[PDB]
Each structure stands twice: as C-alpha cells, then as structure tokens.
C-alpha cells in the first residue's frame, strides 16, 4: 500500500493557479464588503444621536424616539429576513459550516442583500449583536457568488472559494488574519472527514481582505487595552480555576440560547408579523437601554477596554453581566440577523474582570492586575459555547496584543472546553446546524 | 446524512484516560527538553574552559578547538550508526511517518541515542539546532508511555505521539502555539482524516511549556525588541522578499538532498568512514566557532545582532554562504541535529540584507532593516519545510512583533507560492519519501 502514499507525498501543496487567482478576488470583495457593512452600520447608530440630541429637552420624548427608531429598524431587519432569506437570521456561521458539508444552500442572490441591509437595521438600531458573524456569512456568499459567475467547477474550488470568502470575512471583521485562517481549520471545516480545502487559497483571500480593511481603517484598532502586566508562574492555577468556571457555564449558556429560541418562537408561532413586531419590540427595547445604561445594550466591544481597566465597580459588573446575559439571548435567540460571536467577547471580558477583582483582594501577594484575567477569560465563553479554543485564543491575541498572557490564555481556554465536555455541552455552533438540519427533514 | 447529525452531537469527546496520559507525556518531554538543553550548553561551556587555558599558543587553540569538536561529533555519529540509524537527521520526517504507520518508534533506542548523541554533535558546536532533536525525542517519550500503560487504540497511539512531538516543539522554542499549529499543519498525515485529539495535544503542550518555564524564566531565546510597524505602501516590498525565498526555497532543497548522497560516497556506508568524516566536519565547525562564530554554531545568537543591522552588507553575504554550506555539510552528513533552527538564522540574515537594500533604494518609506529580517526569518521555513502557518506563528511566538503579522504572512505566502510554481516540495516529506522508498527495494 505504501506505493500510493509515496506518490501523494511527492505531489503535496499543488493547488490549481486559477483557484488561487479566484481566492484573491473573493478576499478582495469580502473586504470592501465587510468595510461597507461596518461603515453603514456606524452611520445609522450615528443618526440615532442626531435624533436624540435634537429632542434632548423633553425626556420621555427621547426615551420614546430612542425606542421607535430602534424598533423601526429592527423591524425593517426581521422583515428583510423572513420574507426574503429565512437563513440569514442568526449568527451566520452554522449555515456556512453546513454548506461546507453540502447539507445547506448558498442562496447568495438572496442572502447577500438580505443579511447586509437586514443587519444594518438590527445592528445600526443598537441591539445586543455583533457585526462579525454577519460578515462571515456574507463572506461565504461572496465566495460562492464568484464561483458561480466564472462557473469553475470541482469540489475543491467550491469548498475553497467558500471557506476563504468565509475566512476572508472573519479577518476583515476583527482585523485578525491569523484567527480568520485558524477558524476555517478548527471550526468551519467539515470535522469528520478529509476535505479539499486549499489552506494556501484561504491565506490569499484572508490577506487581500485584511488589506482592504486596513485601507479604510488605519490608525485605529477595535480594542486598545494596552500592555498588561505578565503572569508569574505561581499565579497560573488561578487561570485554570477561571476556566473550569467558564467550563460549567459554557454549556449552560448554550441550553438557554437554544431553549430561549423555542420559547421565543411561541410568541409568533411562525407568523412573519407576530415576529416582525416582536422584533422592533426587542430591538426598540435595546435602543432604549442604549441610553439609560449603554453597558447593557450595544455590540459590547466599547465596554471591554473599560472593563479590563477595572473602572467598573464589582457590582456594576455583575449588573452588566446578567443584563447582557439576557439582552444577548433575547436578541440572538430571537433569530434576528446579527452575531453572537462578538457579544460573547464582552461577556467574557466582564465575567473575567470580576474573577480578577476577587482574586486581587484574595491574595495580594501575587501582585495581580485584574485586567490579565479579563483577557484570560475574554475568549473563554468562546471556548465553551462555540468550542473552538484555538480560533478563540488566537482571535484575542490578534486584537489585544498581550502575548505575555498566552500561556494563561491557553490554560484558561483549556479548562474552558474541558468542563464544557465532562458536563454535557456541545459546539453551540454545530448544535444549531443539527437542530436546523434535523428540522429540515423529519418534517415529512 | 443521518449519520452526520449523530456525529455532530458527539463532537469533542475524547477519553479522559488519554487526556490524563497527555499530561504525563507533556511533562516528561518538558524535563527532557530542558535537560538536553542544559547539558548541551554545559559542553559548549567546557569547550571554552579548554580554549581559555591554551589562549597563549595559537595553533594550540585552533588544534584543541578542533579535536574536542571532532571527538564529540564522532561520539555522536557513532552513537547513531551502531545503535539508532534513524535518529541521525532532523528527527521530524520519522515522527511524521510514524504517524502514518510506515516507520517505527524504537524509543528504547532512539531516546538514549538521540539524546547523548546530540550532546556530542551539538555541544561540539556544529551548524545544527537542538529543536528538532526535541521534536523526535518528544514523540518517543510519548510512545514510551503509550507502551508502559499498554492503553491501546489508534487514537491513543496517534494522540500520545503527536503531543509528545508537539510538546517537544513547544518546550524547545518556548512556543506553545506553534507547537500545536505544527502538529496540525505539517506532522498530521496530510491526505486522510486522523484520530489525533487536538485537546490532548494542548494539555501536553502546556504542561511541558510549564516545565520549560520552570527552569528558564527571565530569559528568552530571541530578544530583538519592538521594531517599527510597516505602512501599507511598503507591503509589496515583502511580497518581493517572498518570491525570493520562493525560488530559493526549493533550491536549498535539492542541495540538502543531493549533498547527502554525494556525502554518502565518502563513506559508502561504513560506520567508520562515516564516524571519521564526522568528527572531521564537526571539528571543522568547532574550529570556525573560534575564527568567525557567525559561520558556525546553532545560529540563534546572531539573529538578534543581524536584525539590529550591526553587520555590514558584506559581512552578511559572507555569513550567508558560509552558513549555506556549514549547514548542509553538517545536516546532509546525517549527523544528529536539526536543520529547523539554523534555517531561522539563514532567514534572518537573507532578510536583513533585503532590508538593507530596501533601506537605501527608497528612503521615503522610512524602513527599518530589521522588519524584513523578521519578515524573512520564517521564510526559508515556508519554502523548505512548506508549513507557512507553523512558521509564521513560530516567529511571532518568539520575537513578539505582531505589528509585522501582515507582512510576515504576505512574505510567507510568496514563499510557498513560488516554491510551488517552481518544482519544490516539503523538504520534510521528501525525505520520508526517499527514506520510505529506499526502505522497500
């Protein structure tokens, strides 16, 4: 049998040039794509001030406007989903994940415009969702779209142009090329069989888009927490404890996200309008919160820097936690277009900072800096809910630059999954495909 | 399909026992790697307490600084041919194969062989690294335990191996990430699904990294400090630098390959025509290690200096070729040691040069030579051993300049891309192939 192997060995890393030349177009478009989506979404959150400041006299007037605008938009969002692309509603990953296994379809001629404009609503409105996931999916579709415009055929160029368009997205999103790559090979990748995904093509897609992003976003990063202290050997165990904690909580947050989406289905039973209404309703609520304690609403990004600094009091955190634990589900379980990828980071930062704070006064001899654990746990709900430690671990380091906490971040993100395992729990990313792939069939 | 849905609900469920073995693997590799490195330094230490004592009569030195390196190299090659033919080499292509089941993990031989052997070759002062020596020694430490607790099953065999391996690459370059990323970009039997439990690798990696950290704190391997960042308009410059490693990547492959045949003739297969040619190359290195150390040695210690820019444009070129040779001649000779390390030094150098040219060719870009020295530090690593990701992340792991992460990719991609459209192949795999095709027949 050793015959075959030896032959394959001499034929390694030989991917067709045409593919590689498509990868570069995919990657590029995703770029301008991701950029645009983010520019627009900011512009609307912008208008939602040029509305609040104008009526900054009559209070309930605000509260009201800062509810209608968010609701009107969320609705326009949910609407553009149900009546045009049922798929889009959601993180966007489980689908891309499936299309890679050939169980779901890449209806890009729908998904793109839907997810794009849709999200601007929901997102620009100010709900508890990220705009990352929205780009991952939008990415994949941009890939397929080109795979269909140049008809190039073959399981390699189908899976490849997809996986990158996807990866190309996750990169331009968090301006994080590595993670973008490491994602497509720890998570998206059809997990139980060899696949014809050309790493080297992903790379080119990722790069190109990262450039596109960098062209229109230079000088400024997403998270600027500055260089924190390092973590001395004797304080390592403390990050394993913090892991176990995310480990037992990791799957719990999964049941809820899951369950909550059923319980929230009852409210509309499947009616575009019982949904579209419940939409602006949750959305508006968020928009109202975004002006009476913004740390409970919004993407969540902008509070991480603040949390990691330690500026929140022990209490204010706990409040920010729960509130978000809810406002997140309620917004994500609602099947609204947006990602649960981002707001999980914020959740982590928070839960982590707390653990920090406790640690700090519990042993003052370790000379700790709460922040370090805020970064330790920043990608911990990411290695328990979505169970992709490597993609998580590297996504943080990608955008917080504290490689002196790489040992702890692993020792924390390992305990994350380890208990998310010995206590039920599963890839919240995969579980959904399963539900959504089992609800497809068994329905006849 | 129905099957899929079932497998989905069963993801990331690896047997605890394995996971508890991983931790033992990882640990031992740790104390292992440590020891090997402590010892090797100790010998390079003695080779001064010998040079300083005879620092009066010159040719006396040159002589002692040749004998000691030769005596040790020989003790090295000897401990290989007469006891573990396999060990001689980087150590990776074997581990790579064992993962496919074509080669064997004769740990009851390899361990002591490779270990003590290396101390000779390495401690002597030849152009080889002590990293690869730990990758392999890693794998074996894995198996060893896989055999001592008899736990059976394709998963616990591949797993306990891959980590012992990964756990090595980590404690080596105090670089846990790369360690992991290695076992899943290179090592991993490339053309089929495998039962390697990532989560087990992780635990192994960690544990050894700790072991390493316990005995190496306060000091790192490369301290080049934070270099400037790289502005968008100067990106293309790193793609150029890639294409250059891309065409040179495979070339350095033929040679390493070829040179090992041409160096075989010299001994035709004779343990003694080899063992002699050994201390001979080795002694030569030990001599150089005292008349222009930048030509000899592991190579690590000159990267910091190169990246700074302290070498003149010439001195570099000299340090390049000399090493291009002193590297092959030492690695192609089948001696025990790794070509993984000295390729870093080659890159740092070739890169720094490209920096230097760039610097004066466009002063408007306000470039800092160093940044390209890091751009290309892992470029010969993405053309010769063609594992971009493991490379890219291994540098960042030990140079801390994540602001060059975009260039380092755009350089490391150009690397492979031309190492592709111009023949070339995984110098790591090529060898298994040769050695696996030379097996049968």
């Amino acid at each position, epitope marked *: 049998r050793r015959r075959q192997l030896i032959r394959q060995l001499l034929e390694r890393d030989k991917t067709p040039l045409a593919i590689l030349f498509m990868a570069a177009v995919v990657g590029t478009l995703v770029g301008l794509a991701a950029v645009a989506f983010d520019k627009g979404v900011a512009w609307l959150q912008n208008q939602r001030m040029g509305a609040l400041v104008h009526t900054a006299d009559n209070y309930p007037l605000l509260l009201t406007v800062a509810f209608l605008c968010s609701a009107v938009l969320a609705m326009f969002g949910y609407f553009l989903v149900r009546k045009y692309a049922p798929e889009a509603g959601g993180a966007g990953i489980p689908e891309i994940e499936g299309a890679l296994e050939d169980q779901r379809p890449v209806r890009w001629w729908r998904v793109l415009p839907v997810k794009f404009f849709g999200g601007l609503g929901t997102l620009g409105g100010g709900m508890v969702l990220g705009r990352q996931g929205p780009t991952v999916q939008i990415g994949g579709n941009i890939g397929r779209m080109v795979l269909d415009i140049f008809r190039l055929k073959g399981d390699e160029a189908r899976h490849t142009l997809l996986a990158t368009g996807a990866a190309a997205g996750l990169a331009a999103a968090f301006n994080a090329p590595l993670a973008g790559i490491l994602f497509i090979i720890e998570e998206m990748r059809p997990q139980f069989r060899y696949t014809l995904i050309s790493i080297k093509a992903v790379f080119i897609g990722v790069i190109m888009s990262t450039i596109m992003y960098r062209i229109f976003n230079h000088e400024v990063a997403l998270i600027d927490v500055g260089k924190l202290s390092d973590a001395p050997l004797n304080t390592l165990w403390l990050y394993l404890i913090l892991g176990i904690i995310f480990g037992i909580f990791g799957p719990i947050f999964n049941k809820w996200v899951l369950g909550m989406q059923d319980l929230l289905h009852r409210v509309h039973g499947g009616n575009i309008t019982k949904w579209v209404l419940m939409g602006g309703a949750i959305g508006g609520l968020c928009g109202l919160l975004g002006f009476v304690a913004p740390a409970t609403s919004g993407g969540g990004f902008n509070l991480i820097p603040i949390a990691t600094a330690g500026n929140f009091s022990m209490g204010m955190l706990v409040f920010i936690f729960v509130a978000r634990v809810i406002t997140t589900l309620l917004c994500f379980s609602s099947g609204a277009p947006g990602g649960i990828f981002a707001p999980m980071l914020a959740l982590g930062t928070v839960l982590g900072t707390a653990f920090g704070m406790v640690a700090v006064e519990l042993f003052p001899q370790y000379h700790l800096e709460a922040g370090t654990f805020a970064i330790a746990g920043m990608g911990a709900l990411l290695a328990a809910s979505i169970r992709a430690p490597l993609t998580g671990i590297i996504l943080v380091l990608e955008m917080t630059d504290n490689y002196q906490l790489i040992l702890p971040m692993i020792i924390t993100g390992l305990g994350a999954t380890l208990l998310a395992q010995f206590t039920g729990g599963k890839p919240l990313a995969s579980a959904i495909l399963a539900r959504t792939l089992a609800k497809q069939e068994a329905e006849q | 399909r129905r099957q899929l849905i079932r497998q989905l609900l069963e993801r990331d469920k690896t047997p605890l026992a394995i996971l508890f073995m991983a931790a033992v693997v990882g640990t031992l590799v740790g104390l292992a790697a440590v020891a090997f490195d402590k010892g090797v330094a100790w010998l390079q230490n003695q080779r001064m307490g010998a040079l300083v004592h005879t620092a009066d009569n010159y040719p006396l030195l040159l002589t002692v600084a040749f004998l000691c390196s030769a005596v040790l190299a020989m003790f090295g090659y000897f401990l290989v041919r007469k006891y573990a033919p396999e060990a001689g080499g980087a150590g990776i292509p074997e581990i790579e194969g064992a993962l496919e089941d074509q080669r064997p993990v004769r740990w009851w031989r390899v361990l002591p062989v490779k270990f003590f052997g290396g101390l000779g070759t390495l401690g002597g002062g030849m152009v080889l690294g002590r990293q690869g020596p730990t990758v392999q020694i890693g794998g074996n430490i894995g198996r060893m335990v896989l055999d001592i607790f008899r736990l059976k099953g394709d998963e616990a065999r591949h797993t306990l191996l891959a980590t012992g391996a990964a756990a090595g690459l980590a404690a080596a370059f105090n670089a846990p990430l790369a360690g992991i990323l290695f076992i899943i970009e290179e090592m991993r039997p490339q053309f089929r699904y495998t039962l390697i439990s990532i989560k087990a690798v992780f635990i192994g990696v960690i544990m050894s990294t700790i072991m390493y950290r316990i005995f190496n704190h306060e000091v790192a391997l490369i301290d080049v400090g934070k270099l400037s960042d790289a502005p968008l308009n100067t990106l293309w410059l790193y793609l150029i630098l890639g294409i250059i490693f891309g065409i040179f990547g495979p070339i350095f492959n033929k040679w390493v390959l070829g040179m090992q045949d041409l160096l075989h003739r010299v001994h035709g297969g004779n343990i003694t025509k080899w063992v002699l040619m050994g201390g001979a190359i080795g002694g030569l290195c030990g001599l150089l290690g005292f008349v222009a150390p930048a030509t000899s040695g592991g190579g690590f210690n000159l990267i910091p200096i190169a990246t700074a820019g302290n070498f003149s444009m010439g001195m570099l070129v000299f340090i390049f070729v000399a090493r291009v040779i002193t590297t092959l001649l030492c690695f192609s000779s089948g001696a025990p040691g790794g070509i993984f390390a000295p390729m870093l030094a080659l890159g740092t150098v070739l890169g720094t040069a490209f920096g230097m040219v760039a610097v004066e060719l466009f002063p408007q*870009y*306000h470039l800092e030579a160093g940044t390209f020295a890091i751009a290309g530090m892992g470029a010969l690593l993405a053309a010769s051993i063609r594992a971009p990701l493991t490379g890219i992340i291994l540098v960042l792991e030990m140079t801390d300049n994540y602001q060059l992460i975009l260039p380092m990719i755009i350089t490391g991609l150009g690397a492979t891309l031309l190492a592709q459209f111009t023949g070339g192949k995984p110098l790591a795999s090529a060898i298994l192939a040769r050695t696996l095709a030379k097996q049968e027949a």
Partner: antibody
Amino acid sequence: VRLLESGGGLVQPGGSLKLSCAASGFDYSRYWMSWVRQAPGKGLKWIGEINPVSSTINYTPSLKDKFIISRDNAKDTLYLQISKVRSEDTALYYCARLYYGYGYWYFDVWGAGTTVTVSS
Amino acid sequence: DIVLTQSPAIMSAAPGDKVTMTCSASSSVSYIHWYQQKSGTSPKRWIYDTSKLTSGVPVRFSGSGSGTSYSLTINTMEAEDAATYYCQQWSSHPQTFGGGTKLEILR
C-alpha cells in the same frame, strides 16, 4: 504633546550654533524627528531627519557637515548643529515629529520655532 | 527633487464663498499634504494623503488631486480661514513643499 525648540539667535558668519528641541507629551522613541527651516518671507525647506535609534540620518542636498542632526532619546531632545553659517542660513528653524497615513510620510506636529540670524 | 508650485500666490474672496487653490508638481506625486499657517504660528497639519481632513479640520475643507496636479478646497470659506496654505509631498525623496497660497478675506 509639546515640541519646544531653543538654541537660535545671533551668530557671526562662519560660526556654529547648536539648536535644541525638547519634546514632551509623547514617547520620543518610535518617532522620526526632523527639522525644517523657513527663511523670513520665503517658504519651508526640509533640513534633515533622524530615526529613533539614530541608525539613519539624512539631509537635503547640502555639503559635508553644514548640518549635523542628532538626538539623545535619554533627554527626548532633538539636536541640530550648523557650522560655517552664512546669510542663507538665517531663518526660522522648526523641529517636527514625523508620522504617516497610507505611508507617504508627513510632518505631523511642528514645534514652536527658534530664529537664527547670521550677522556681525 | 520635485518642484511643487502652488497656483494662486495670493487670493481674496468673501466668506461663504467657494475657494479653491492649486498645487502642481513638476513630475509625479501622490498623497499630497497640506499645512495651514496663520500669522504668528508654526504650520498646522490640515489635509493629508490628498484628502483626509485632520482631526479637527472643519468639514468645510476638502482635499483632491492626482499625480501631476492637486488641489485643496473650501466650500463656503469662513473668515477664520485667512492664512497661508502649504501643499507638500514626500511621494519622492527628498520631500518638498509648495510656494504657498495666501488666503485673504473680503469684508
């Protein structure tokens, strides 16, 4: 971020004066410091630039050592030595801090000024 | 070295008016810059990379141009715009500044 340069003044032809420029309000390192002078009434003319580690220093097309820019990062101060001065050297001397956008460097934060008058 | 020559050497226009000043390069440039210099003060970085207003520059101002010829504009200039604008390039070493344009207000 203050860029305050002293030193200027009165110097007789064929003389030498060490202009100083003390920085404050930012990290001196990571920064390429330069000088540009404005001749009374006329425009600006770039003199030199000296990278962080001072491992690079360039000047305009001017001979040997008319100019000698240096910097003591230990004192976050930029220096400029003009030797064998002549009337063409009478102008306002600014020390700027250098940065860039897409990469085609600009003079970021120009300091105050200091005047050098060549006369007897 | 590049010879940047700013067109109007001196010009006057009444506030709320649309004013535009040119800056031609002898050869070829890209990503020009602009500095504003009001009497008694060292220059101030106004526009850059051919049209990126600096943090603070009124959105009144706009940059433009390409390769051989660039410009800077003020949609409805205000009186507080009286100053001397200097376009500068460094797309070719050594950098070079323009002759400057002196804006004067008609009131």
